[PDB]
Amino acid sequence: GRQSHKKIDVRNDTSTRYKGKLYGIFVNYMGEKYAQQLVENMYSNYNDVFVEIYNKMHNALRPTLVKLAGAGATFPLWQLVNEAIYAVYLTHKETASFLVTKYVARGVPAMTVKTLLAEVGNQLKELVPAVAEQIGSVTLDHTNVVSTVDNIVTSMPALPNSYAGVLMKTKVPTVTPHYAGTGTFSSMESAYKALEDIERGL
Amino acid sequence: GRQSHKKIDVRNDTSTRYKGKLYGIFVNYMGEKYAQQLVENMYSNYNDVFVEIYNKMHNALRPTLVKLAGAGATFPLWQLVNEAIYAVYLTHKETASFLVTKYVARGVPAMTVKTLLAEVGNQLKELVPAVAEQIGSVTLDHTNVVSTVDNIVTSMPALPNSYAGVLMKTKVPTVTPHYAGTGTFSSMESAYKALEDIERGL
Amino acid sequence: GRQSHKKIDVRNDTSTRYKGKLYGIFVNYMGEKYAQQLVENMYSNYNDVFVEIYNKMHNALRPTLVKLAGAGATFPLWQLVNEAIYAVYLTHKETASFLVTKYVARGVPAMTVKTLLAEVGNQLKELVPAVAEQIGSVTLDHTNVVSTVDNIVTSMPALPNSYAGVLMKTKVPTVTPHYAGTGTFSSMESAYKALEDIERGL
Amino acid sequence: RRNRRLSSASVYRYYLKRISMNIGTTGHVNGLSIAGNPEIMRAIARLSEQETYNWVTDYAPSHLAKEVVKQISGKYNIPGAYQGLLMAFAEKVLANYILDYKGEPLVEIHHNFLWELMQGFIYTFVRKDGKPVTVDMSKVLTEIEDALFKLVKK
Amino acid sequence: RRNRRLSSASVYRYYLKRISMNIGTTGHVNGLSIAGNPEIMRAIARLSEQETYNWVTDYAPSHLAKEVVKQISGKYNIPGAYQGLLMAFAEKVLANYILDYKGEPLVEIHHNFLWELMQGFIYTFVRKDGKPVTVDMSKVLTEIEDALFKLVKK
Amino acid sequence: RRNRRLSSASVYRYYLKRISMNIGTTGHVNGLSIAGNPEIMRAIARLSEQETYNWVTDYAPSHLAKEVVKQISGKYNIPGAYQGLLMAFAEKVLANYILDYKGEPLVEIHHNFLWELMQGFIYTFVRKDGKPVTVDMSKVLTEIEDALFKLVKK
Amino acid sequence: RRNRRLSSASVYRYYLKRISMNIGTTGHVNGLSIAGNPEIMRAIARLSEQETYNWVTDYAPSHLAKEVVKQISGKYNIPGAYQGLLMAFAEKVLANYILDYKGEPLVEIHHNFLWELMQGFIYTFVRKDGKPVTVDMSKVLTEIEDALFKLVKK
Amino acid sequence: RRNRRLSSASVYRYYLKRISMNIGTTGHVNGLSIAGNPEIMRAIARLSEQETYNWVTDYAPSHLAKEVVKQISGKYNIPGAYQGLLMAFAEKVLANYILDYKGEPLVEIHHNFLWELMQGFIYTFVRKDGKPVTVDMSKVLTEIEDALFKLVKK
Amino acid sequence: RRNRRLSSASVYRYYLKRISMNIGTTGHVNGLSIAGNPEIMRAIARLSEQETYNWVTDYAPSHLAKEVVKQISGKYNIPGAYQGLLMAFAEKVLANYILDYKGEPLVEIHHNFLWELMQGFIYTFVRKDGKPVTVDMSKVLTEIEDALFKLVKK
Amino acid sequence: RRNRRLSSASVYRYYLKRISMNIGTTGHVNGLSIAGNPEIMRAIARLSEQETYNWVTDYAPSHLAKEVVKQISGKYNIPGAYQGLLMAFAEKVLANYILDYKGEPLVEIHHNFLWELMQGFIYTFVRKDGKPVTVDMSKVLTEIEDALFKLVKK
DNA sequence: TATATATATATATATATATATATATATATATATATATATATATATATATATATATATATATATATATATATATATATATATATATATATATATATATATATATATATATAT
DNA sequence: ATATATATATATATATATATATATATATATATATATATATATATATATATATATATATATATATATATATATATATATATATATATATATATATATATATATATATATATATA
Secondary structure, three states: OOOOOOOOOOOOOOOHHHHHHHHHHHHHHHHHHHHHHHHHHHHHHHHHHHHHHHHHHHHHHHHHHHHOOOOOOOHHHHHHHHHHHHHOOOOOOHHHHHHHHHHHHHHOOOOHHHHHHHHHHHHHHOOOOOHHHHHHHOOOOOOOOHHHHHHHHHHOOOOHHHHHHHHHHHOOOOOOOOOOOOOOOOHHHHHHHHHHHOOOOO | OOOOOOOOOOOOHHHHHHHHHHHHHHHHHHOOOHHHHHHHHHHHHHHHHHHHHHHHHHHHHHHHHHHHHOOOOOOOHHHHHHHHHHHHHOOOOOHHHHHHHHHHHOOHHHHOOOOHHHHHHHHHHHHHHHHHHHOOOOOOOOOOOHHHHHHHHHOOOOOOOOHHHHHHHHHHHOOOOOOOOOOOOOOOOHHHHHHHHHHOOO | OOOOOOOOOOOOHHHHHHHHHHHHHHHHHHHHHHHHHHHHHHHHHHHHHHHHHHHHHHHHHHHHHHHHEEEEOOOOHHHHHHHHHHOOOOOOOOOHHHHHHHHOOOOHHHHHHHHHHHHHHHHHHHHOOOHHHHHHHHHOOOHHHHHHHHHHHOOOOOOOOHHHHHHHHHOOOOOOOOOOOOOOOHHHHHHHHHHHHHHHOO | OOOOOOHHHHHEEEEEEEHHHOOHHHHOOOOHHHHOHHHHHHHHHHHHHHHHHHHOOOHHHHHHHHHHHHHHHHHHHEEEEEEHHHHHHHHHHHHHHHHOOOOOOHHHHHHHHHHHHOOOOOEEOOOOOOOOOEEHHHHHHHHHHHHHHHHHHH | OOOOOOHHHHHHHHHHHHHHHHHHHHHHOHHHHHHHOOHHHHHHHHHHHHHHHEEEEOOOHHHHHHHHHHHHHHHHHOOOOHHHHHHHHHHHHHHHHHOOOOOOOOHHHHHHHHHHOOOOOEEEEOOOOOOEEEEHHHHHHHHHHHHHHHHOOO | OOOOOOHHHHHHHHHHHHHHHHHHOOOOOOHHHHHHHHHHHHHHHHHHHHHHHHHHHHHHHHHHHHHHHHHHHHHHHOHHHHHHHHHHHHHHHHHHHOOOOOOOOHHHHHHHHHHHHHOOOOEEEEOOOOOOOEEHHHHHHHHHHHHHHHHHOO | OOOOOOOHHHHHHHHHHHHHHHHHHHHHOHHHHHHHHHHHHHHHHHHHHHHHHHHHHHHHHHHHHHHHHHHHHHHHOOOHHHHHHHHHHHHHHHHHHOOOOOOHHHHHHHHHHHHHHHHOOEEEEEEEOOOEEEEEHHHHHHHHHHHHHHOOOO | OOOOOOOHHHHHHHHHHHHHHHHHOOOOOOOHHHHHHHHHHHHHHHHHHHHHHHHOOOOHHHHHHHHHHHHHHHHOOOHHHHHHHHHHHHHHHHHHHHHHOOOOOHHHHHHHHHHHHHOOOOOEEEEOOOOEEEEHHHHHHHHHHHHHHHHHHO | OOOOOHHHHHHHHHHHHHHHHHHHHOOOHEEEEEEEEOHHHHHHHHHHHHHHHHHHHHOOHHHHHHHHHHHHHHHOOHHHHHHHHHHHHHHHHHHHHOOOOOOOOOOOHOOOOOOOOHHOEEEEEEOOOOOOEEEEEHHHHHHHHHHHHHHHHO | OOOOOOOHHHHHHHHHHHHHHHHHHOOOOOOOHHOHHHHHHHHHHHHHHHHHHHHHHOHHHHHHHHHHHHHHHHHOOOOOHHHHHHHHHHHHHHHHHHHHOOOOHHHHHHHHHHHHHHHOOOOEEOOOOOEEEEEEEEHHHHHHHHHHHHHHOO
């Protein structure tokens, strides 16, 4: 017993593992070059959607999850924030009432849900412009978040999940972390990438 | 339940998926080089017809669909715009009366149909010259679209679908988005393509 | 029902489809290299005869067919022009009387038949020299086409279809569209071909 | 492809061609090895058989429509071209209206196909006896409709 | 893919395509050598068979749901589009609520799918006789719900 | 990976993926040549089979633990998340304590996992009837403890 | 340089010319020896690639501005000169105000560019039909402003 | 250069000569070292290819203009020189007017080119049969105008 | 040098410019011969690589300081100039105090930089909405202090 | 490597890894060509087979030793760590003394391993019931000694 | 067609030359091979024990990394399947006729 | 016979057009939803392996020593002798081809007119 203690996260190689394994599978479908281009496009899409949104959200929110219900038993919070990013924002398929009802049914305190919804909104408005405009300039809090987001969702109908998928960021270009203004802070991460290839003779 | 949330769209790899899968299938018919040329020509045609017409129309109309009947239940609108681009334009096989009758029979408000028809006219005249000339210089609206399109269709006979298929763009060349005048705006999309291969050492 | 709307025409790949499929069949008869040369020669002949004559005539006549009897029910016009190219010209097997009688029997107005015969003659004289010399310098019209073509055909006996098949263009070389004079206009088609292979690394 | 009256030969043609397509499909690239295994071969054979069976069972109505159109044309002495055209028309009207009823009235399709047949709709035909005859398209169009509804017992 | 009513053809199609996927999976790069060996070939064949069997056994409920939704549409003369939409709705309600009961009440999903169907919920439909008829979505929604509970014997 | 109830398909999946890993292991660089030889191929196949058999034989106890945790959650109306969490707890406690007995008392692990489940230990849950219920974590923890010893007949 | 529509050719042109500039930079005088070494050559290649990649990534906004200016001009029939000038204005206002918001109100820039366009603000243009038309500068200026605010959804 | 009908030869000639120009461009002085590297070589190759593709795409209109001018001249038995001149005229009128509509009415360009053709506008040509014929420049100039408007369907 | 956001391009630029400086250093006068030697060339390459590596590893702290200063400015609507000035201040206070702790108390540096910012410490800023706001220099200086201590967890 | 109970998996693992080592051994550089030859391949296969057979036949004694050490620890409730340590002790004493008898008396090795086990020779262990127990290292050391002689029938 | 320039080719005798071949012996130089023994050099091998460096194996536990496998749900990327309709593309299949192309069948003359 | 031409004509199927239409399947959109996967997170827990340590042992192998001996082959000598080749010189003589002469022609190209 007690074999090991695995850790599941984005480890600066999930890109490569994904590309490699899927390439290996698809060579038996496409031939070399087609499989190459295919896995390239597949990972690019997966990156620009899932990484850019969900991973940034998870990294931002993890400390608050630990403060509130510090435990391995935070998985319900993770699925909650996932559905928040998907079901409510970018789709307006459900009102805050649904989530709060569901997770108090799942045993989560209400104000916790309200707080998490507030923060995920406060950061998602920074990530995607469309939500930032739909909510406008309102700081979310467990006292005002439910009413505001419920107004926003009911004002709109259910949007097709195509909005949640790709096109949202596709149509609108954004400031890079390689710009002036508020895009001059993070490339440190990418910076390492550069160093890496130089050391590998690349 | 609720396994996933799929999204169906042109994801900058449908070219590769199409080419690869059909190449794999056909190599057991042609051999390598012949299957290669075959899938090349096949995707070329499918691109320059379906992409250039239908996908541009869909990307133009999607916001208006969400405005009008924002829902997952916009599939009738999609099939409507498909039939409009095919059955009425480029073929003159049916008049506006037919579509409006059919879709109110399917439960669609008539003036909505008229608006969508007006807009698909206003954009197809931009995409295809022949339709722009058949309609002339008249802005369509849910007040006048039906009369004008009925005049045009009744003036013409049922045209062979050979027009709607390939020949339309084949016989007449158009201004590229790589030109002066009104061809100086979109290559941004294509631009990315170039960058991509440069990064891949291609 | 209403599964799809197929369109049947030359799509810059019928060359490859023909070659590949017949190659696949004939490998089980001749072996690789023999089947290769066989399909190469077969398609070359089919090209230089059927394409150069019938497809050019079809591309010329399609618009006038749509003007005259715009319909999907234009097939009788197509078989009419086919017989005209085969039975009357290049063989002198029948006089205009036979075609006009047969197609008015099939429900075609006479002056339509006369007009179509006039135009197909007016272009066939441009395509093939021998027919141009047989008719001389007389612009055909529904007022004079019948008498002229009847004189030409009765002047001749029935000619062996070997003329209509291959030999006609085989014996006499013609000005290429890669020439000065009246051969300086069309290579755009072939031009695209060249560009294509350069993009394929070919 | 040229016209060929339906017969068992057509069934077998479709069967074998589907065999080729399926062996192409399964071993997307490794067609040879898949061709060498007898078990996947049996599976592909049975699949192609079932596919032919489906395609057959969903075609008899079209055959009956073409049959009644043939009978009507024979009764009106119409050249083959328009016989095939009316076969296709009967197919269309049974498919979109009789079976699935896409939302369109019959007379709408009637006038659609009328404009399809214009050039107007009373064509003259010369029988083998030299006696010219005339028939109205819209008349026979409606005529086969009633005959069609008689078949399905609508 | 185009809509095709489920039949054995679908079973075999899924079977063979899973064959291709598994032969791709095992020999991650050495697909050819793996393809040549008949033993791993038998293993992959049996695996794809088992996977097809699993997928079949976990689909009959959705099949019955689509059946009853089809019946309801037929008795209320609903066009194909909304037939498929209500099929999907019934599938959703049986999955998330009837089988697993994720923590959400029925009428909540009811109003959710109501907003899904808005434009607002009493759509007027023209039958083949020309007699226009109107139906409330929420009513026929609530109708299939209780009828569904009758199926599972809840 | 997504949740999948254990079945023979899982056995076969593990089998084939271990085949790939082993053919990778033997021919560290010359994977192709080793892939070509049928004898080493037979050896690798049998090794993968043996390893799968090992992994299967050394997993049934965890399966029994997951079963009893499922029964307990079913009788106590617990959402899936905590069902899986308690499955994991039961696996841990049987492994480190019941089978190998690493040197630690039971109630110590009990309090450890209690702090694991805190936020405190009496959670309120809403059944399908709308009737809220409350359950103590430490009680049901101790509850499945006894039932666990009942299984192994400790 | 003459006006050329954006294209991949532009990307590659910028790439190569930056290559020349960088090979000039590194070997400040000993350009030949640095040109002879393939390693520093690969380094310079990747550097120029990165610079082009950046310049592409940070140009799409100005591109969309030019796009919407083009659409508006086409709708109001202006000769190319003023179309380019309004593209310039749109980029100005999005850069200084929309993105970084240097300390200046919108209407201030509006009047600034107005005096830029004066001579005097309702210009007359003769369309291709011979019908003369007039348009106010300040009006369409404010018009494209709101349109621009719509794009970024400001 | 001498008159040579457009052909694939032209495409390849332009391609290779642009290769030479680009390799001249990048290595402004160190052309040799740049010529030695295969990577920048691939870059230059793809650049020249893209440039040829651009130039090809932007020539079909002028080509069709030359085509219809050739047809008209053949119809009116005009010596090659004036055929080329009218080709150039059609290119001009489509470019400046039909595509971009620089601010000038058609008839103005007509009279411009009329003075271009004077010496005065009814030229007499002796056909191959010895039959002299006369044609008015202004007439045929107008003739190709309407014909041109038909091509683009203007 | 003008403001440029950090990026991989900066890494490469530092790399190449260090190459130039090193080749200048080694062959003090006969730099040409050293430039011709490939071995010393590899040595210089690896030297410049290690140099960039050092410089990068010794920059992340100041970068994070600039980041948090950017966040504070964003929440307090500060013009760019003062944002950069506070970035520099945070860099100074982490360097001299948090890392090495030269002999000076926090409030001493605080008042030093305050006299740096005087003219006196409550500046008026007019946001994009036209609403003027005021902020105390000393307050936010104290604010980023504790905030900085939070980052390094000091 | 992590602990793994001896089973056929171990046999096959050693077998294949020795295959890799041998194919590396024979073709000191030309590993590929030797890898392609099936005859030398069979040779290497049989060699690795014989090698595993040797290694197996030379391990049963150590297996029996570890078995009896396990039994003794079981009767004296000793944690796994010291179980493995005593297994190693027993293997040492059987090898160096019982089989080959290197020149050393038993009690000498006994005191050697005693100095190995000090910190000092009566360790206190708290059983699963909470009842602590103490055991003298030297006693059980001598105890497994004689028991070992009983096995070998010395 | 006419030159000249040398490139080869086919018809009969001299070069240096090597292509060799033989056919006869004699050399030196060498590649090997024996036949007896002697070295040094290194290739393994066995004998006994000792190291070091590794390759695995086990014996207990502990890590990180990973390959999977579950157990709960949530994503993303897909692979299919379905349910509704619509495309384009192509696989066939009809229904009428027309081509070319070639696959075989039906009237006399050559290979 | 099989197969190829030289005319006329079928049927048959191989494709390709020429229109209309099916059904089927190949993909692709368009929405809703499954189900099965391929991965990826998110926590918890296994199990099995790939490694890495953390101690103690094995066996096995790879090398290296530390002595003694083999046998085997790698070379090198030590002497006598072969045998086979690599050349070389001796003399005589063929044939073959590779270049150069010594005449007469070709044909073929490289040029030049």
